[PDB]
Design an enzyme around this catalytic site. Structure first.
Site, short mmCIF file in Angstrom:
data_model
loop_
_atom_site.label_atom_id
_atom_site.label_comp_id
_atom_site.label_asym_id
_atom_site.label_seq_id
_atom_site.Cartn_x
_atom_site.Cartn_y
_atom_site.Cartn_z
CD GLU A 1 2.36 -6.67 8.26
OE1 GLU A 1 1.34 -7.13 8.98
OE2 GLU A 1 2.57 -5.46 7.94
CG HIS A 2 -1.17 -7.38 12.27
ND1 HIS A 2 -0.87 -7.98 11.08
CD2 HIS A 2 -2.26 -7.16 12.58
CE1 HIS A 2 -2.05 -7.85 10.58
NE2 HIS A 2 -2.95 -7.30 11.34
CD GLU B 1 -6.39 -7.56 10.33
OE1 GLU B 1 -6.39 -6.68 9.79
OE2 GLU B 1 -5.30 -8.56 10.50
#
Ligand SMILES: CCCCCCCCCCCCCCCCCC(=O)OC[C@H](COP(=O)(O)O)OC(=O)CCCCCCCCCCCCCCCCC
Lengths: 412, 53
Positions: A51-52, A128
């Site tokens: 997804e990233h 993150e």
């Protein structure tokens, strides 16, 4: 008078659904039945890292080419991943409908994972995760999932353990991509100013040939999870506030009493206190997420428990009517906006296999009365073992005997 | 035997009470032990982990 959601199916198997409305800002979106539940602890962050990276680079659009295109028409590009579904959606104008679909086609197939890009993302994701711990409610809900679904693929997280994130191979990703991106497990959903016939044409041209055949017939399959009543108590007394989530096992997507349970949530001290009905396939977590100062968690727990039992024993018609009215205003629709309507279609075609119209939702709401609400609440809340997840100054949070026992009223 | 009886006319009645007491305690001690071990299993399985940041 709400327009119906029309669903077609392509040979590949991907379902190109759609919906139409006067609006002119369509949200096209691809939903995929692939999440952390389909990962096998050796690729626990593959969906998140894809997804990233999916947006950052595709074979046809090298480097940041895609993000430029998307800038050229002024469209917005979003993606998200849950434990069961992955979504790539674009909000754009109506007249830019073809190229957007073509863009989405690249994002699902022909995507390019630049080993360099892989590395850059590794940093982003690791950092993150290294700062994600900051968000408490996310920590508490991850703890609740882990302790409620111990030993199953539903305990893990979308992000996955740091290790898996560090160790990822273009090939591993390629696998997840080539394994969980099959055409029969895909829905092309459109909401707003779109024509269904034009979208069905566009679908074939750009989204045909989506893979459908697994490797060596390694056809995935799924496990009905177990709801292990258990607790987790991450004590850290330096935090100013405490977050506590208590849940029981939910029914699932296809069980209609969900609607009744939603009314029960609409019926329901310690700062925030939101009720929730996380509902994965074949299981879910009905419950509550209450934040609170360390000295009131205890009372809150009692209040929460009290409310539940009241709903198992002494539900009246007025609060049921109030909950039905509150639910009937959570109906998603064109006035909710395209993106919301867009999303529903994708989730409805992935979970139910069809788009449930709002009239059927209204019928299932109006058939709910007080007697069946307290029956279903006694079926799902009364004398059940909960999953408890606490984070913060949680010493006065009661242990498992006080919680479980509090779930049964000695007076019924 | 008689003098004994004299010094304890209840000898027989008591022993019947003692037999009922032994049967009731043999029923009730493992059951109360099982209830205690239920309500104390939770802790006896608790796994603690230290995770300094
Ligand atoms: C918790 C413990 C509760 C007391 C003990 C329970 C197990 C024994 C119960 C009596 C068993 C029995 O022999 O029944 C027949 C027997 C009477 O014989 P029956 O009349 O022929 O049935 O009951 C008794 O044992 C009488 C003496 C009971 C004393 C229990 C000990 C605690 C006394 C506290 C006083 C305050």
């Amino acid at each position: 008078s709400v327009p119906e959601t029309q669903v077609s199916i392509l040979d590949n198997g991907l379902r190109v659904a759609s919906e139409q409305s006067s609006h002119a800002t369509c949200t096209v979106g691809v939903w995929i039945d692939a999440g952390s539940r389909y990962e096998t602890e050796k690729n626990n962050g593959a969906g998140y890292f894809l997804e990233h990276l999916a947006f950052k680079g595709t074979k046809n659009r090298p480097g940041n080419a895609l993000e430029k295109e998307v800038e050229s028409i002024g469209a917005h590009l979003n993606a998200y991943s849950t434990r069961e579904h992955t979504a790539y959606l674009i909000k754009a104008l109506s007249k830019d409908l073809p190229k957007v679909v073509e863009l989405l086609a690249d994002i699902v197939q022909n995507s390019s994972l630049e080993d360099s890009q892989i590395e850059k993302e590794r940093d982003v994701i690791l950092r993150e995760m290294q700062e994600n711990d900051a968000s408490m409610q996310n920590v508490v809900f991850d703890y609740l999932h882990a302790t409620a679904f111990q030993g199953t693929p539903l305990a893990q997280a979308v992000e996955g353990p740091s290790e898996n994130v560090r160790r990822l191979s273009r090939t591993d990703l390629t696998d997840y991509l080539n394994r969980h991106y099959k055409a029969p497990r895909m829905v092309l959903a459109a909401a707003g100013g779109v024509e269904h016939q034009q979208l069905l044409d566009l679908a074939q041209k750009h989204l045909s040939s989506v893979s459908r055949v697994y490797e060596e017939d390694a056809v995935p399959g799924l496990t009905p999870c177990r709801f292990t009543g258990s607790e987790i108590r991450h004590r850290d007394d330096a935090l100013p506030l405490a977050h506590v989530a208590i849940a029981v096992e939910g029914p699932g997507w296809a069980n209609p009493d969900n609607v009744t349970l939603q009314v029960a949530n609409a019926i329901i001290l310690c700062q925030s206190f939101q009720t929730f009905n996380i509902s994965y396939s074949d299981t879910g977590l009905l419950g509550a997420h209450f934040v609170c100062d360390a000295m009131s968690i205890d009372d809150m727990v009692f209040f929460l428990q009290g409310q539940w039992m009241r709903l198992c024993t002494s539900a009246t018609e007025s609060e049921v009517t109030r909950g039905k009215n509150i639910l009937r205003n959570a109906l998603v629709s064109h006035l909710d906006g395209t993106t919301p309507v867009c999303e529903d279609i994708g989730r409805s075609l992935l979970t139910y296999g069809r788009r449930i119209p709002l009239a059927e939702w209204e019928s299932r709401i109006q058939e709910v009365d007080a007697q069946m609400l307290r029956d279903i609440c006694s079926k799902y809340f009364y004398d059940q073992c909960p999953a408890v997840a606490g984070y913060g100054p949680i010493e006065q949070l009661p242990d498992y005997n006080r919680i479980r026992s509090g779930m049964f009223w000695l007076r019924f | 035997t008689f003098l004994r009886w004299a010094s304890e006319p209840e000898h027989d009645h008591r022993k019947r009470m003692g037999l009922k007491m032994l049967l009731m305690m043999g029923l009730l001690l493992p059951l109360t032990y099982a209830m205690k071990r239920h309500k104390w299993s939770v802790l006896k399985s608790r796994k603690l982990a230290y995770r300094p940041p």
